[PDB]
Amino acid sequence: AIYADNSYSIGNTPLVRLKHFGHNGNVVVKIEGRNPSYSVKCRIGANMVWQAEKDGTLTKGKEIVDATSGNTGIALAYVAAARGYKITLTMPETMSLERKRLLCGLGVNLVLTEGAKGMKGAIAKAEEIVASDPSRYVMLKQFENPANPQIHRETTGPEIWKDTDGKVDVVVAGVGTGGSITGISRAIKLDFGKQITSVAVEPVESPVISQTLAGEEVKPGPHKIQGIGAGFIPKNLDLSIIDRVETVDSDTALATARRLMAEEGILAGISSGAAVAAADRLAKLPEFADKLIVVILPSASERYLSTALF
């Protein structure tokens, strides 16, 4: 029916079967680009705000603060605009320029800094702005806020289960906050009770999850895969439900996104390319040859025109 505001219109994204990846259509993709602010972050942008409202921590007159740098900022921005909250977002410069472009149009207070142009400086600045009548600023903290995986457990997961009629065997998802794969895996494994394979994807340039799990030296690095590879283990990543970790490189991720466009007619982002690459690698193993693989496509390629995608 009719939604009270845009934040209520989150989710219910479609599953599309791939024809040039996997083995006879065992790879299907969930296109999260079909969201109110056109990324997966719309869900947590809505639910974090809702939960902060229900906890009383978010009230009229209080300002929203977070670091994000990516799609979470856009989601929080549209939700704040829709539900009447002033919002300040912290980020140096500047990747990507469309990220930087939308936020100003959505009327968020962009505070621009530069440690070495980094999230260290951004988060520090966020903490500082919070430290100024802290009863006026509220930090939602997407990396540890339980509402983040909660919304994925309540919507995304059940949507996957519903649309696959409980046939989903594998879920492949890149990890940024970890919320997506955490919530989804919790929903399908615990609430529905099916023992699927949860597959986390990370850049091979910064495989901190693989390194941690293997008990090797954790060495984060630079990469071109927007949205994932935070370079640390976020609190919203539930390692306990992670069955498998796949690493993908920036070049292959990019090429895979381009392939989604040109061959599948799917306008997918870089991290979407990475997720699809990992999922394809799994799909062409006999072990998963006859299993249904569901792959999360977080964002849309139009948010990457300024990047190396084009």
Binding site: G70, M119, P222, H223, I225, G227, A230, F232
Partner: peptide, 8 residues
């Protein structure tokens, strides 16, 4: 490029 929480 991206590292400690950038672009998320």
């Amino acid at each position: 490029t991206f590292e400690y929480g950038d672009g998320i």
